[PDB]
Design brief:
part of a larger assembly, 2 chains, mainly alpha, viral protein, Spike
Chain lengths: ~25, ~50
């Protein structure tokens, strides 16, 4: 679901980079 | 073993009377736990 009321500011505290691998 | 982010453990505890080797007879290990841990494993080390 869209979350612009909670997760926008921009909000650079949100970050991005096998099945279910947690490749931190 | 690892399959698709699950780390599976099987085990058996059995009596023996041979210090020098594994037994020549037959026994089957049964599942202990099936951990959804999602890591990559290529090496391991026992803890003493």
């Amino acid at each position: 679901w869209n979350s612009n009321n909670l997760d926008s500011k921009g909000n650079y505290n949100y970050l991005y980079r096998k099945p279910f691998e947690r490749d931190i | 073993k690892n399959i698709d982010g699950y780390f599976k453990i099987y085990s058996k505890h059995t009596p023996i009377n041979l210090v020098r080797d594994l037994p020549q007879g037959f026994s089957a290990l049964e599942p202990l736990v099936d951990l959804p841990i999602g890591i990559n494993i290529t090496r391991f080390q026992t803890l003493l």
